[PDB]
Amino acid sequence: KNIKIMRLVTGEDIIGNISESQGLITIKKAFVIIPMQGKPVQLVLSPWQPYTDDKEIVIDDSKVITITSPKDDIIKSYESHTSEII
Amino acid sequence: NIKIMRLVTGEDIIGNISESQGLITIKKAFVIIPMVQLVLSPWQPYTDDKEIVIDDSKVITITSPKDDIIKSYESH
Amino acid sequence: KNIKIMRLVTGEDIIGNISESQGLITIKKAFVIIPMQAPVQLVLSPWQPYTDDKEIVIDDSKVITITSPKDDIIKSYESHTS
Amino acid sequence: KNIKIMRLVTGEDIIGNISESQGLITIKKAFVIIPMQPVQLVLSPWQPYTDDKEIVIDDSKVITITSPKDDIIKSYESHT
Amino acid sequence: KNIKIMRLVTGEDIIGNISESQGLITIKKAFVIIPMQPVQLVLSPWQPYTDDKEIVIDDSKVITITSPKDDIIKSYESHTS
Numbered sequence: 001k002n003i004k005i006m007r008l009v010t011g012e013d014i015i016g017n018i019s020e021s022q023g024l025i026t027i028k029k030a031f032v033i034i035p036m037q038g039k040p041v042q043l044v045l046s047p048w049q050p051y052t053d054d055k056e057i058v059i060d061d062s063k064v065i066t067i068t069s070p071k072d073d074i075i076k077s078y079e080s081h082t083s084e085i086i
Numbered sequence: 087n088i089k090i091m092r093l094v095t096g097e098d099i100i101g102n103i104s105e106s107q108g109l110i111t112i113k114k115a116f117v118i119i120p121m122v123q124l125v126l127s128p129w130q131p132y133t134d135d136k137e138i139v140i141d142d143s144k145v146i147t148i149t150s151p152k153d154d155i156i157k158s159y160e161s162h
Numbered sequence: 163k164n165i166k167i168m169r170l171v172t173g174e175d176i177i178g179n180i181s182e183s184q185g186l187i188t189i190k191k192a193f194v195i196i197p198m199q200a201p202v203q204l205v206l207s208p209w210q211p212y213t214d215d216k217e218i219v220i221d222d223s224k225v226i227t228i229t230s231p232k233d234d235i236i237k238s239y240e241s242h243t244s
Numbered sequence: 245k246n247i248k249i250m251r252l253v254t255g256e257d258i259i260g261n262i263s264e265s266q267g268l269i270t271i272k273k274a275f276v277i278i279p280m281q282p283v284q285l286v287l288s289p290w291q292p293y294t295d296d297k298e299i300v301i302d303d304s305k306v307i308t309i310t311s312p313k314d315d316i317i318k319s320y321e322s323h324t
Numbered sequence: 325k326n327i328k329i330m331r332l333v334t335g336e337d338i339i340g341n342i343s344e345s346q347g348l349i350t351i352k353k354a355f356v357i358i359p360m361q362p363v364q365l366v367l368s369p370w371q372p373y374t375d376d377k378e379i380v381i382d383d384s385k386v387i388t389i390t391s392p393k394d395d396i397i398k399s400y401e402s403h404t405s
Contacts, residue, residue: 005371005373005374007334007371008146009094009146009333009334009385010092010094010096010146011334013373015373033373043373049092049147049149051090051098051118051124051149051151051152051155052090052149052150052151052152053150053152054149054150057147057149058147058148059146059147060143062143062382062384063094063146065332065333065334065381065385066371066379066380066381067380068371068373068374068376068379069374069375069376070373070374071373071374071375074373093226094171094226095169095171095173095226130169130227130229132167132175132195132204132229132231132232132235133167133229133230133231133232134230134232135229135230138227138229139227139228140226140227141223141226143223144171144226170307171253171307172251172253172255172307210251210308210310212249212257212277212285212310212312212313212316213249213310213311213312213313214311214313215310215311218308218310219308220307220308221304221307223304224253224307252387253333253387254331254333254335254387291331291388291390292363293329293337293357293365293390293392293393293396294329294390294391294392294393295391295393295394296390296391299388299390300388300389301387301388302384302387304384305333305387
């Protein structure tokens with residue numbers, strides 16, 4: 001698994017299993033990181049493209065501002081959001 | 087070929103798509119407004135044009151819709 | 163005289179006399195289409211109010227769609243530039 | 245000296261002394277035009293976080309470059 | 325130390341240690357400048373969801389790169405240790 005966080009050009013933060021072939025990024029199990037509360041901030045993962053059943057999503061790398069590896073806290077929740085556990 | 091395009095402007099559009107050259111031609115295009123009930127409304131209400139062309143650089147993702155979305159789109 | 167509607171990348175809808183030479187669009191008598199309600203009515207207002215320029219040039223990369231307007235919209239546009 | 249108004253791709257309207265060398269625009273004395281509600285325009289410094297005299301933007305980040313109405317040049321001139 | 329302020333294409337203003345190799349900008353210790361309310365500024369970490377020390381952005385996503393006023397560097401420096 002290559003789990004990374006993409007800041008999109010639309011402003012959102014996406015988290016998923018990423019592979020970069022050609023000039024395209026293929027994303028599996030993609031979630032948007034929605035923060036919220038002036039008290040502590042709880043991060044919420046929700047499915048990025050709720051209007052589709054597609055397993056893989058392709059975006060051109062031009063539509064991504066940064067690709068970044070998540071804090072351990074965030075990978076654990078992502079993992080428990082997508083798979084079966086220890 | 088009914089697909090859902092997330093535009094660079096943030097919107098989600100649904101329509102009959104064909105990709106020739108580096109352009110996408112869209113027939114019968116609707117914007118998906120959520121509020122959950124999803125509502126389809128005509129994308130470009132200011133025009134009678136049957137086909138609309140966008141450069142693919144202005145689309146973030148092209149994705150195939152869930153069955154209930156297709157049914158509603160069809161019924162429109 | 164070619165009147166079309168351009169959806170800009172900034173979100174706005176512009177209407178004007180359009181000519182496409184090189185990879186640039188030249189626009190004459192350009193108006194923004196502002197809609198509103200409280201029957202949804204459309205209002206045309208000058209696109210670039212800070213200038214007297216008769217022609218404005220935009221790279222076509224900043225336009226999402228170029229589309230021919232409904233008859234009602236042309237009539238109002240025609241009446242607005244008179 | 246060449247005072248023009250640039251609509252940026254971020255939405256803003258900037259006014260400044262513009263020179264176009266290479267595919268880059270260099271701006272001196274740059275102000276953002278903020279309107280508010282007979283509409284009143286206010287010029288405020290574009291980049292308040294810097295003392296730089298010249299600022300460079302790639303022309304792909306500019307939607308239009310346009311010459312200002314006389315009333316706007318006068319105010320700009322008096323702002324400097 | 326090359327501390328600069330980048331206005332991104334998404335609207336934000338970032339401050340950090342910048343190096344430009346290839347057509348990419350590498351940023352170390354990056355903070356967003358949030359203003360509020362006298363002009364009043366807060367520096368907060370730009371990418372809070374990551375531990376990465378370096379962040380790479382294509383220069384096409386940056387509108388302007390600009391050197392900060394002295395008081396902004398001093399805060400940035402005191403915010404970085």
